[PDB]
Amino acid sequence: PGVQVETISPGDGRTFPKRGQTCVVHYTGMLEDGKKFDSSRDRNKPFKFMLGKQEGIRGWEEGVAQMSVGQRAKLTISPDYAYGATGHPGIIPPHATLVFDVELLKLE
Numbered sequence: 296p297g298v299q300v301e302t303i304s305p306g307d308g309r310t311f312p313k314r315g316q317t318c319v320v321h322y323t324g325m326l327e328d329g330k331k332f333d334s335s336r337d338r339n340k341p342f343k344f345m346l347g348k349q350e351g352i353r354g355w356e357e358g359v360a361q362m363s364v365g366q367r368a369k370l371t372i373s374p375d376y377a378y379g380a381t382g383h384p385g386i387i388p389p390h391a392t393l394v395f396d397v398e399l400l401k402l403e
């Protein structure tokens with residue numbers, strides 16, 4: 296409900312990120328039925344982060360944790376699992392549902 300994870304291409308079905316593990320991903324984020332606000336693909340540089348230890352929005356952490364290595368997935372994140380009633384001023388409006396197209400490339 297807070298985050299829906301829908302497969303674009305399956306992963307290995309077996310290797311999922313552990314809390315504290317470094318995840319290497321490509322992503323594109325857009326406002327649902329609106330504008331693209333960020334893409335690591337457009338920078339040709341994958342995004343690395345430590346799941347849990349480097350805190351992200353709830354739907355990102357819980358959505359990526361549900362993915363296995365190699366998986367590409369559409370994450371639809373409700374505002375309560377994203378930036379909420381305040382949004383992220385200047386970038387994400389109040390009460391925004393977010394879509395991320397995420398590909399889990401590697402776990403380090």
Ligand SMILES: CCO/N=C1/C[C@@H]([C@H](C)C[C@@H]2CC[C@@H](O)[C@H](OC)C2)OC(=O)[C@@H]2CCCCN2C(=O)C(=O)[C@]2(O)O[C@@H](CC[C@H]2C)C[C@H](OC)/C(C)=C/C=C/C=C/[C@@H](C)C[C@@H](C)C(=O)[C@H](OC)[C@H](O)/C(C)=C/[C@H]1C
Binds near residue numbers: 332333348349351378
């Ligand atoms: C994963 C963890 O990494 N996330 C990050 C940002 C995250 C969100 C802003 C964080 C707050 C934390 C507090 C909670 O209260 C807030 O709740 C409302 C959420 O962003 C996201 O969660 C999502 C999902 C991942 C891709 C980016 N993202 C977006 O929405 C965007 O696409 C956006 O364009 O990203 C961009 C921002 C705007 C979004 C719409 C991302 C931004 O660019 C230039 C980048 C890459 C910034 C990097 C900062 C690094 C700083 C370090 C010193 C330390 C760092 C590792 C930490 O440890 C921090 O702690 C102490 C914290 O951990 C941070 C800042 C992690 C970064 C890597």
